[PDB]
Design an enzyme around this catalytic site. Structure first.
Site, PDB file in Angstrom:
ATOM      1  N   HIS A 480      11.476 -19.158  -3.278  1.00  0.00           N
ATOM      2  CA  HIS A 480      10.980 -17.918  -3.846  1.00  0.00           C
ATOM      3  C   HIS A 480      12.044 -17.320  -4.793  1.00  0.00           C
ATOM      4  O   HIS A 480      11.867 -17.367  -6.015  1.00  0.00           O
ATOM      5  CB  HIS A 480      10.534 -16.929  -2.750  1.00  0.00           C
ATOM      6  N   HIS A 485      11.898 -15.931  -9.389  1.00  0.00           N
ATOM      7  CA  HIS A 485      12.611 -14.749  -9.902  1.00  0.00           C
ATOM      8  C   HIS A 485      13.878 -15.057 -10.728  1.00  0.00           C
ATOM      9  O   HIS A 485      13.971 -14.669 -11.888  1.00  0.00           O
ATOM     10  CB  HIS A 485      13.001 -13.805  -8.742  1.00  0.00           C
ATOM     11  N   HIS A 671       4.954 -19.077  -8.308  1.00  0.00           N
ATOM     12  CA  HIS A 671       5.358 -17.857  -7.640  1.00  0.00           C
ATOM     13  C   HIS A 671       4.241 -17.343  -6.747  1.00  0.00           C
ATOM     14  O   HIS A 671       4.488 -16.928  -5.618  1.00  0.00           O
ATOM     15  CB  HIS A 671       5.764 -16.769  -8.650  1.00  0.00           C
ATOM     16  N   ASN A 675       4.703 -16.616  -2.777  1.00  0.00           N
ATOM     17  CA  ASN A 675       4.856 -15.198  -2.526  1.00  0.00           C
ATOM     18  C   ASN A 675       3.729 -14.580  -1.695  1.00  0.00           C
ATOM     19  O   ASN A 675       4.023 -13.891  -0.719  1.00  0.00           O
ATOM     20  CB  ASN A 675       4.993 -14.426  -3.840  1.00  0.00           C
ATOM     21  N   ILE A 820       6.155  -9.228  -8.577  1.00  0.00           N
ATOM     22  CA  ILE A 820       6.503  -8.547  -7.323  1.00  0.00           C
ATOM     23  C   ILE A 820       7.267  -9.512  -6.429  1.00  0.00           C
ATOM     24  O   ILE A 820       7.868  -9.155  -5.401  1.00  0.00           O
ATOM     25  CB  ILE A 820       5.210  -7.988  -6.647  1.00  0.00           C
TER      26      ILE A 820
END
Ligand SMILES: [Fe+3]
Length: 820
Positions: A480, A485, A671, A675, A820
């Protein structure tokens, strides 16, 4: 002769978490049109006169919530040509959010549209006037000659000079290392290593903030109350409940201290005693003192996470994984199934040899040959030879990842861990069967086999927990945080620094960056920092982010493509007869089977967009913005890996497609897949424990006796304690929620993002293709032959790659971006 225009904007208070509309009139907002076709003596497009907003336009039906429209007329004579840009000067003291300008012409074809979506502060704050371009797309060599300098000057405005503290209204993109996470000026124990800029600790770069050095360590950046992002990355929201990213800050600075005080005052038992104590969290709730609840429930975002009676009760939502069967998470079938259809479905590998071997240095760690024997395994009647040859053996290997850190972890007061391996067998019915777990320590190292009865069945249950502690830590820090990110942010920075807003590849990629710098900056401040949420709830404590640096050493951009990933992990083979070019060795593998559908649709879109603008391979080579973009992204943004031979060179159409496809894949589907399952699977702490606190009890101890008499308490004493569970449950609830203003794959925020009708039509086809894929995935979840892996004993259909979703905690929907 006048040109009629309409300006749409939102005033500042519509997007915050008082305005007056008449104040925009008078001489308070000026626009000046800029010619695309007639230049001055220096070759620059001619600039018209200051022109002020005339009046409010309420007679406009296309207005959205919070939007206001203003009429304007521009005096523009025959010497001025055709407008292609404009300047705007805000003389008010308050900033506003500029959406668009539209100029009206005799025909609908002659309408000129400017899509701005940019905050505009008072003009004294800016070094150069704010400029905006019409929505026509141009590779650089096709830019109208009178607009060339402006296009180049605005790119210079976005790059800054590498120095200075960044202020709220700056739009300056640049790179820095991860040196902002420690807090040594508060306490030496909060010092952290700088990540990036060395071969010892390589890392992707992050957005430069420029706050300057701490007093005690010139290497580390001093704290700030706000962690800057370039202004138009700091997203506003019409509804306060949609500012999820801000909830992570409130959780760390207001909620976590409040929870800790309840435990310090012995107002609630400090440990869970039984599994029912954990289930209580979403049934009757947890009882807390009134002043804690009164600290929590006034807070935006935070108040949406719980039900409460306002006096003593906080309830958590019921997690998906327990919605049908409270106990199915304990089964070996579910444990294995979540490796191909859970929160972290992308680590399992095929085994082509046996026993598995280590790649670590025997001088430091020892013989590291596995201690699993072939004949201890129950392979449903297969020999090891036959199982290997038929490609029915797989493993979840955390040995070489965790072994280098276990000693340091096990010397922390609140952690004890093993480095684990899990051997899986693919049954004839197509489901995975765990057949052995190996628990290793450096410098005893045990093999545990399945068992349904007796004390050995409890030992097996605890062995599964240690595996999933490994897996939770790897998922959060690597699958993750690192792979999505952190790896994406440097491409965001490079794009704004080097691709004009006019550029076709800017328009292609920037929707896939929405909110990414913003959530990352909030995460450096409150999630991944020293004594932050991740350090205080996941196993490695102060070693958490540095472990992700060790894994980045081996990160390969081109292996992030889904077919390449599947091949490299030995879960598929290349096969040109199949529709996607790969054959899955685990046929029902839901993440991979659904992912390949999404991958293919994105590929088709990129392959149909790029040739609109790049007819020949030379056109890629000759695009200076594109060449500077990719050079900087590789040599600065991912600069600690700039030497590696696998970076694409970007000299061909095929390279450009590949690079764009991989970036879009990471930011959207990859993602989403890692997530949005976090609270649905992980909201039951027993199913996804974040930490372990002890090793396996030795025979003849009271901890062993307890294990025989009360397996539940032995399990709960091993995994994450109650207070970090409350904190981590709260954070993964936030991270699992879709905001109502999310923009999903196949959507864009403005339908006039380009004037090129061919691009618009290719985009429509992409969105239609996604709707038909969704229908295909629905059918897969209804196919009784696929139930074993798509639903499992927890009876939970795999919907994490359905492209669409409504707002909330839905276990579905693919955003455009890492939002997010
Ligand atoms: Fe995320």
């Amino acid at each position: 002769h006048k040109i009629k225009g309409t300006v749409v904007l939102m005033p500042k208070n519509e997007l915050e978490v008082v305005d007056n509309l008449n104040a925009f009139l008078g001489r308070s907002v000026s626009l000046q049109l800029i010619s695309a076709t007639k230049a001055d003596a220096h070759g620059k497009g001619k600039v018209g006169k200051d022109t002020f907003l005339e009046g409010i336009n309420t007679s406009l039906p296309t207005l959205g919530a919070g939007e206001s429209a203003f009429n304007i007329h521009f005096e523009w004579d025959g010497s001025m040509g055709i407008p292609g840009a404009f300047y705007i000067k805000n003389y008010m003291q308050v900033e506003f959010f500029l959406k668009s300008l539209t100029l009206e012409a005799i025909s609908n074809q002659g309408t000129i549209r400017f899509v701005c979506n940019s905050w505009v502060y008072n003009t004294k704050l800016y070094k150069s006037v704010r400029i905006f371009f019409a929505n026509h797309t141009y590779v650089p060599s096709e830019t109208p000659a009178p607009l060339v300098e402006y296009r180049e000057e605005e790119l210079k405005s976005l790059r800054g000079n590498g120095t200075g503290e960044r202020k709220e209204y700056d739009r300056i993109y640049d790179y820095d290392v991860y040196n902002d996470l420690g807090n040594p000026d508060k306490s030496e124990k909060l010092a952290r290593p700088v990540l990036g800029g060395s071969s010892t600790f390589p890392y992707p770069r992050r957005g430069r903030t420029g706050r300057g050095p701490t007093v005690t360590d010139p290497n580390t950046e001093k704290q700030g109350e706000v962690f800057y992002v370039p202004r138009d990355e700091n997203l506003g929201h019409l509804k306060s409940k949609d500012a999820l990213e801000i909830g992570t800050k409130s959780l760390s600075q207001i909620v976590q201290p409040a929870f800790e005080s309840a435990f310090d005052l012995k107002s609630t038992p400090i440990e869970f005693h039984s599994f029912q104590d954990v289930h209580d969290l979403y049934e009757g709730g947890i009882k807390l003192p009134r002043d804690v609840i009164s600290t929590i429930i006034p807070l935006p975002v935070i108040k949406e996470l719980y039900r409460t009676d306002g006096q003593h009760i906080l309830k958590f939502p019921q997690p998906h994984v327990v919605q049908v069967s409270q106990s199915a998470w304990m089964t070996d079938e579910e444990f294995a199934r979540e490796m191909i259809a859970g929160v972290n479905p992308c680590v399992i590998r095929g085994l082509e040899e046996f026993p598995p071997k280590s790649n670590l240095d025997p001088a430091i760690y020892g013989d590291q040959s596995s201690k699993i024997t072939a004949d201890s395994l129950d392979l449903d009647g297969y020999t090891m030879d036959e199982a290997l040859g038929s490609r029915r053996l797989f493993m979840l290997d955390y040995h070489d990842i965790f072994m280098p850190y276990v000693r340091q972890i096990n010397q922390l007061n609140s952690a004890k861990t093993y480095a684990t391996r899990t051997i899986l067998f693919l049954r004839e019915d197509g489901t995975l069967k765990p057949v052995a777990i190996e628990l290793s320590l450096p410098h005893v190292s045990q093999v545990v086999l399945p068992a349904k009865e007796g004390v050995e069945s409890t030992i097996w249950l605890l062995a599964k927990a240690y595996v999933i502690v490994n897996d939770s830590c790897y998922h959060q820090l690597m699958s993750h945080w690192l792979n999505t990110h952190a790896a994406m942010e440097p491409f965001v920075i490079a794009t704004h620094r080097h691709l004009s807003v006019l550029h076709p590849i800017y328009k292609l990629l920037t929707p896939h960056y929405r909110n990414n710098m913003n959530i990352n900056a909030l995460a450096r401040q409150s999630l991944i920092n020293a004594n932050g949420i991740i350090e205080t709830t996941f196993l490695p404590s102060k070693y958490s982010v540095e472990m992700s640096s060790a894994v980045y050493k081996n990160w390969v951009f081109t292996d992030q493509a889904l077919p390449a990933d599947l091949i490299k992990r030995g879960v598929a083979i290349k096969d040109p007869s199949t529709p996607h070019g790969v054959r899955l060795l685990i046929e029902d593998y839901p993440y991979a089977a659904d992912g390949l559908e999404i991958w293919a649709a994105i590929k088709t879109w990129v392959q149909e967009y790029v040739p609109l603008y790049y007819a020949r391979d030379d056109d890629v080579k000759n695009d200076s913005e594109l060449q500077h973009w990719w050079k900087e992204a590789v040599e600065k943004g991912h600069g600690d890996l700039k030497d590696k031979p696998w970076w694409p060179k970007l000299q061909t159409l095929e390279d450009l497609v590949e690079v764009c496809l991989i970036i879009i894949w990471i930011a959207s589907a990859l993602h989403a897949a890692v997530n949005f399952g976090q609270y649905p699977y992980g909201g039951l702490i027993m199913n996804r424990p974040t930490a372990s606190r002890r090793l396996l009890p030795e025979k003849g101890t009271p901890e062993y006796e307890e294990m025989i008499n009360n397996h539940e308490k032995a399990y709960l004493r091993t995994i994450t304690s109650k207070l970090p569970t409350l904190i981590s449950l709260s954070v993964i609830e936030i991270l699992s929620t879709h905001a109502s203003d999310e923009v999903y794959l196949g959507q864009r925020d403005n339908p006039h993002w380009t004037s090129d009708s061919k691009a618009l039509q290719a985009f429509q086809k992409f969105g239609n293709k996604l709707k038909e894929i969704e229908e295909k995935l629905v059918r897969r979840n209804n196919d009784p032959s696929l139930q074993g892996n798509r639903l499992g004993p927890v009876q939970l259909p795999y919907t994490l790659l359905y492209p669409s979703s409504e707002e909330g905690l839905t276990f579905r929907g693919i955003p455009n971006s890492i939002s997010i």
